[PDB]
Amino acid sequence: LRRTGVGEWLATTCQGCTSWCAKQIYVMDGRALKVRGNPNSGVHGMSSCPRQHLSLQQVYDPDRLRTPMMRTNPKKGRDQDPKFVPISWDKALDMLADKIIALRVANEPHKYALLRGRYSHINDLLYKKMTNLIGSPNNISHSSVCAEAHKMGPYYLDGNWGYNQYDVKNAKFILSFGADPIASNRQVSFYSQTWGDSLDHAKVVVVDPRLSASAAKAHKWIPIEPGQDSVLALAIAHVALVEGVWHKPFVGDFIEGKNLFKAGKTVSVESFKETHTYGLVEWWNQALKDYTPEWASKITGIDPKTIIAIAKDMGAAAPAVQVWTSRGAVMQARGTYTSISCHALNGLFGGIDSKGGLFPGNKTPLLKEYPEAKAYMDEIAAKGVKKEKIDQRGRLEFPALAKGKSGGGVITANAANGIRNQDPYEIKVMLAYFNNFNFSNPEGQRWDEALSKVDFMAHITTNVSEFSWFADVLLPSSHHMFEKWGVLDSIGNGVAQISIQQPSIKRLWDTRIDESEIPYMLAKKLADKGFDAPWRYINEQIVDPETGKPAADEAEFAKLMVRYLTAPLWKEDASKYGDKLSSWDEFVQKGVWNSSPYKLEARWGKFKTETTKFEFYSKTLEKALQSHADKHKVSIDEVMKACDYQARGHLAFIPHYEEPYRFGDESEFPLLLVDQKSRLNKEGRTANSPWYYEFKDVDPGDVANEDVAKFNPIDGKKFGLKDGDEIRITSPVGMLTCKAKLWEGVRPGTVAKCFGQGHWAYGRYASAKFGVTPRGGSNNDLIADRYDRLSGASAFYGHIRVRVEKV
Amino acid sequence: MRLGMVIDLQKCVGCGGCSLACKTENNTNDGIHWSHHIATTEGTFPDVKYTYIPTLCNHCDDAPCVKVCPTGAMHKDKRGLTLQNNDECIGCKKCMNACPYGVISFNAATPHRRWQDDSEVVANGTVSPLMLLKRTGATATPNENPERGDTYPMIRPKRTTEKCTFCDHRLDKGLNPACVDACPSEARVIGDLDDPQSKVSQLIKLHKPMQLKPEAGTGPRVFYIRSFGVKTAY
Numbered sequence A: 001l002r003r004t005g006v007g008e009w010l011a012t013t014c015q016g017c018t019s020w021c022a023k024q025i026y027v028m029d030g031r032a033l034k035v036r037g038n039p040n041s042g043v044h045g046m047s048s049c050p051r052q053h054l055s056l057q058q059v060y061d062p063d064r065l066r067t068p069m070m071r072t073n074p075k076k077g078r079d080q081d082p083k084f085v086p087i088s089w090d091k092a093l094d095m096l097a098d099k100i101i102a103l104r105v106a107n108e109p110h111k112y113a114l115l116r117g118r119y120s121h122i123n124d125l126l127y128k129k130m131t132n133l134i135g136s137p138n139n140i141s142h143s144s145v146c147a148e149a150h151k152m153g154p155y156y157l158d159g160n161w162g163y164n165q166y167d168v169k170n171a172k173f174i175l176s177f178g179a180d181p182i183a184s185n186r187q188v189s190f191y192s193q194t195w196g197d198s199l200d201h202a203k204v205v206v207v208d209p210r211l212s213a214s215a216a217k218a219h220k221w222i223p224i225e226p227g228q229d230s231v232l233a234l235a236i237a238h239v240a241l242v243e244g245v246w247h248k249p250f251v252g253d254f255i256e257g258k259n260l261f262k263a264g265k266t267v268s269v270e271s272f273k274e275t276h277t278y279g280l281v282e283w284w285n286q287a288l289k290d291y292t293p294e295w296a297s298k299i300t301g302i303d304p305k306t307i308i309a310i311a312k313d314m315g316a317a318a319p320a321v322q323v324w325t326s327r328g329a330v331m332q333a334r335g336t337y338t339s340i341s342c343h344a345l346n347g348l349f350g351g352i353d354s355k356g357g358l359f360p361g362n363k364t365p366l367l368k369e370y371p372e373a374k375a376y377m378d379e380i381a382a383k384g385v386k387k388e389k390i391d392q393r394g395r396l397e398f399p400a401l402a403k404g405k406s407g408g409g410v411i412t413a414n415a416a417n418g419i420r421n422q423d424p425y426e427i428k429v430m431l432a433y434f435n436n437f438n439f440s441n442p443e444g445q446r447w448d449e450a451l452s453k454v455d456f457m458a459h460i461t462t463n464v465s466e467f468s469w470f471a472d473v474l475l476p477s478s479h480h481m482f483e484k485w486g487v488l489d490s491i492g493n494g495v496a497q498i499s500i501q502q503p504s505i506k507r508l509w510d511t512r513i514d515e516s517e518i519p520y521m522l523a524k525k526l527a528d529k530g531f532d533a534p535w536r537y538i539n540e541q542i543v544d545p546e547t548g549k550p551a552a553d554e555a556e557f558a559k560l561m562v563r564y565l566t567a568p569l570w571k572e573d574a575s576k577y578g579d580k581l582s583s584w585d586e587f588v589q590k591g592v593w594n595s596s597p598y599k600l601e602a603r604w605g606k607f608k609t610e611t612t613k614f615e616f617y618s619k620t621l622e623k624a625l626q627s628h629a630d631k632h633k634v635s636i637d638e639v640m641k642a643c644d645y646q647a648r649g650h651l652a653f654i655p656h657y658e659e660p661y662r663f664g665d666e667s668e669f670p671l672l673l674v675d676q677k678s679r680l681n682k683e684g685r686t687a688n689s690p691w692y693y694e695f696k697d698v699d700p701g702d703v704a705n706e707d708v709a710k711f712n713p714i715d716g717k718k719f720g721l722k723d724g725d726e727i728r729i730t731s732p733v734g735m736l737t738c739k740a741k742l743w744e745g746v747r748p749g750t751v752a753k754c755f756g757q758g759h760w761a762y763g764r765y766a767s768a769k770f771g772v773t774p775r776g777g778s779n780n781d782l783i784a785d786r787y788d789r790l791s792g793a794s795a796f797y798g799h800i801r802v803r804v805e806k807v
Numbered sequence B: 001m002r003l004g005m006v007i008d009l010q011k012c013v014g015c016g017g018c019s020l021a022c023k024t025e026n027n028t029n030d031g032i033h034w035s036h037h038i039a040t041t042e043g044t045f046p047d048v049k050y051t052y053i054p055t056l057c058n059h060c061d062d063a064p065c066v067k068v069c070p071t072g073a074m075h076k077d078k079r080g081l082t083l084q085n086n087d088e089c090i091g092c093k094k095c096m097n098a099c100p101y102g103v104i105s106f107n108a109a110t111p112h113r114r115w116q117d118d119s120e121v122v123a124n125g126t127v128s129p130l131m132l133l134k135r136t137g138a139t140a141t142p143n144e145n146p147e148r149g150d151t152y153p154m155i156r157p158k159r160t161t162e163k164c165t166f167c168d169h170r171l172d173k174g175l176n177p178a179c180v181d182a183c184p185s186e187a188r189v190i191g192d193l194d195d196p197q198s199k200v201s202q203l204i205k206l207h208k209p210m211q212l213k214p215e216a217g218t219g220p221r222v223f224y225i226r227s228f229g230v231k232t233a234y
């Protein structure tokens, strides 16, 4: 009669962070009881971070929506109770469909916007195709409030507009500018699995204004002043050249063998023969020759002997050297050149695409888009998609140079400003999913204002979050991890994997899957009302890869969307890229497809840069800036000035020191905010889980069941603070209240506080009084709306000055 | 037989995953955590040391919790585990105070009372704890693990004590403790300390282990090897 072990394990994927780990769910008596890493995973195996267990308080969250709703208070605002009442799916989508069709009749489909927060790889239909067919260019992702500045170095130096995996198992030196990979970043499960072991063969240095978990388990913690990371990166490169310890097999060497790099002195470009890099000597002559350890120590306070020793240790470890950048180092108004300066070291020491270094995700045959929709665009749609985007990307002061294109990248946080100012125009109809921009974007009160000015908005969400407060209609989502068909990927351990999301329980409430069932039902409703292009596109183009037939109903369509994109993994023989799977059923049962190991040096000699080299002098960035300048009939120097960078001339294209942007009077606001994530944050989605609070002190220095801001005792004494005091923290743009904690792991002159609390909605555990009073304090109310304009990224670090007081 | 655990502090990342797994496995009330931790910060900036030690019941050789128990409810089994016949617990609380490690908890409240609430944050729109309880068919909390009931109350009554049982119900089936499977670095290893060939027996011969409060004289059987931090360079 014993029951231990008699349940079933079913494969899915976690999305508590962009690690996107493959999981198994243990189900008994129809309930999900356990989560573990999927042993079939080649990236991480059964290894997991702690947040996997919090998933069970999300699907079984007692504040989830069980029905569509409409607001009945016609006023919108933080001060206005929406007075939601229940309606049917048919009525909710009827209301949305009517508003969309009215835009098309009025020849203003560009006044529709689709907002995307989290997502899976089946998102193309809801995000792009539905939006363009309606006739709008305003499919707005969250990428620029995430980490687009972190892609600038990799793209403009080695052609990778994307992330890297870090070969920790083979590393001999690990240098982290703000990354804390045993707590956050993009494979917490795998880097936690390996971090302790790696300390036995790698020297590890963590540069962070706070003592992170990773820094506590490192050979050196460098408590950098916020925004000064590039000073250390540049001085390390300088010493490497003076000492002659760049990685010659990758970079090259002087023609006559003798090292001619002497501090402060220019060198003939023609005396050096580069192999797989471009621009080393120009970089030296234009800037790096004067970035001495003494220069760096004066700015940072770091011992120059420590800088020199690090550079020499990296030289001896090459090419098994890897340099990490986090959001904290690069999501700053001038942060593009921190990504470039730190990532340049991965080329200088040969770690890029090398054993022990870092490299991109492996190739897989997963499809990422549904078929082209060109035949389904009518004249109304063709005209609308050409309009300027609501986030103003591509204007002189917003180059947002994703993948080398002026206006190529989203500017998520600025969409609130375009909407608020009706510039370029008014947004009249909005559909949003899996997002909470009032809470997650800097100075989110701007989204309060913007959303209050939108005639009709519908939010696809599990919970009534802060963003939902401003909705006309709520469309409750089936939970991504337990009630949904989806597909994701992950990279690490030298491989890329593709994993399934599948329902593991009977659907709890009257919800629908955001990315499949809802666009399908909406397309059907639009067709009933005379606009059938989305419906025709769906049932003629998204058909089963085996039978060629369209879906018979909602539930079938949810699975079909995954079958369509994954067919190359299980319908074909994918052996050339990794695993050979025999059937769709085997894919579902195992839950994951694994690639072959990464082929080291694969990209050497064929980077997707202008020169095909690893560019210390980025001709790739020069070409992109030239394009933007020519578009606006100005010089590149005038672009730099308009975007508030210090660089002029050749400095715009090389690693160089930008003084960090700061906002506010330092005498009034004497502390620099050090925003951090909680290691129990599933992005902005675990504040309504009681277990989160019970264990909140696993964040070093923090306090269970509380929201604390951490001060060094020096500053606590200065401002008369004691542990447990209720405090108000104020910046030039806003304030929050929380409690005080004194902790020596905080750099004096800074205050380290986790993002994630401060909800005033979401649920009964996340808020003090639902809809009225927050629990804890909302970090982004402190953070002025600022941008790394070359990337479009929002700034969350470095520029935030605050003051503190009791009560 | 004397089962015990070896925890490798260099592998440990101080994440609490073991303690969260214990919650899902054993149905402990909110605020009751059989697995927990002891964290310390030492030093003045910039020379700051942060360390984390995971804790559980040490299933001691000479257990004060067993010795003080007036009814014999707390007792040793044939594996060396300290287990509790919860039905015979009269709630005298002596075990909790006698335990030098503070790992025993008392059910002052009926567990999972928060799930009897039928209030809704959005009326007729969001659900409630009671409504979710009814929908899932669970008795006390939708997260309750029925496996726990194999050898111990799935939900303990008010006025009884409770602590880590070494996942005895999983051991009975040849399976691992929940915290062991939950650890990403495999930092936790269990086995028979009386068997010289067990991995735990070899681990403590290969490394000089640390124990918690060895001066109390209980003969704890959780051993810690290596160190959470590493030697500072430069």
Ligand SMILES: Nc1nc2c(c(=O)[nH]1)N[C@H]1C(S)=C(S)[C@@H](COP(=O)(O)OP(=O)(O)OC[C@H]3O[C@@H](n4cnc5c(=O)[nH]c(N)nc54)[C@H](O)[C@@H]3O)O[C@H]1N2
Pocket: A016, A017, A018, A019, A146, A147, A177, A178, A179, A180, A183, A184, A185, A186, A188, A207, A208, A209, A210, A212, A224, A225, A226, A227, A228, A229, A325, A326, A327, A328, A329, A674, A675, A676, A677, A678, A679, A680, A681, A682, A683, A684, A797, A798
């Ligand atoms: N536990 C957890 N893990 C996650 C997520 C989550 O929500 N929770 N989110 C996932 C996602 S979406 C993302 S994009 C990635 C992001 O992962 P990362 O880019 O690695 O960085 P963050 O986790 O955002 O943490 C920022 C860190 O920078 C520090 N820092 C702050 N200011 C500065 C500075 O000026 N200089 C330097 N050197 N450091 C500074 C903070 O102390 C903090 O440790 O993580 C993913 N992993």
Ligand SMILES: Nc1nc2c(c(=O)[nH]1)N[C@H]1C(S)=C(S)[C@@H](COP(=O)(O)OP(=O)(O)OC[C@H]3O[C@@H](n4cnc5c(=O)[nH]c(N)nc54)[C@H](O)[C@@H]3O)O[C@H]1N2
Pocket: A116, A117, A118, A142, A145, A146, A147, A433, A434, A435, A436, A437, A439, A440, A441, A460, A461, A462, A463, A464, A465, A466, A477, A478, A479, A480, A481, A514, A675, A676, A677, A682, A683, A684, A685, A755, A779, A780, A796
């Ligand atoms: N100060 C500070 N701000 C930050 C960060 C930080 O470290 N510090 N991290 C930033 C980063 S890296 C990111 S990527 C962004 C992310 O920011 P967002 O994309 O806005 O994501 P969340 O805040 O997690 O909001 C997710 C919302 O989706 C809803 N929802 C929740 N679960 C589900 C589900 O299963 N299905 C569907 N359809 N909806 C669901 C809820 O309304 C939830 O509030 O936040 C960013 N903002």
Ligand code: SF4
Pocket: A014, A015, A016, A017, A018, A019, A020, A021, A048, A049, A050, A051, A052, A187, A188, A189, A682
């Ligand atoms: S929260 Fe992130 S790292 Fe942790 S199990 Fe989920 S996806 Fe993996």
Ligand code: SF4
Pocket: B007, B011, B012, B013, B014, B015, B016, B017, B018, B019, B054, B182, B183, B184, B185, B187, B188
């Ligand atoms: S799960 Fe493992 S790594 Fe995490 S705290 Fe527990 S013992 Fe340490």
Ligand code: SF4
Pocket: B056, B057, B058, B059, B060, B063, B064, B065, B066, B082, B098, B099, B100, B101, B102, B103, B104, B163, B218
């Ligand atoms: S740790 Fe405490 S509860 Fe566990 S056996 Fe020892 S004395 Fe008893």
Ligand code: SF4
Pocket: B065, B068, B069, B070, B071, B072, B073, B074, B084, B088, B089, B090, B091, B092, B093, B094, B095, B096, B160, B161
């Ligand atoms: S509280 Fe229960 S188990 Fe503890 S000593 Fe008293 S009767 Fe024994």
Ligand code: SF4
Pocket: B018, B021, B022, B025, B026, B034, B035, B056, B057, B163, B164, B165, B166, B167, B177, B178, B179, B180
């Ligand atoms: S052995 Fe079992 S009962 Fe003990 S701490 Fe680990 S999960 Fe909890």
Ligand SMILES: [Mo]
Pocket: A018, A145, A146, A147
């Ligand atoms: Mo992100």
Ligand SMILES: [O]
Pocket: A018, A146, A147
């Ligand atoms: O991402």
Ligand SMILES: [O]
Pocket: A018, A142, A143, A146
């Ligand atoms: O993202």
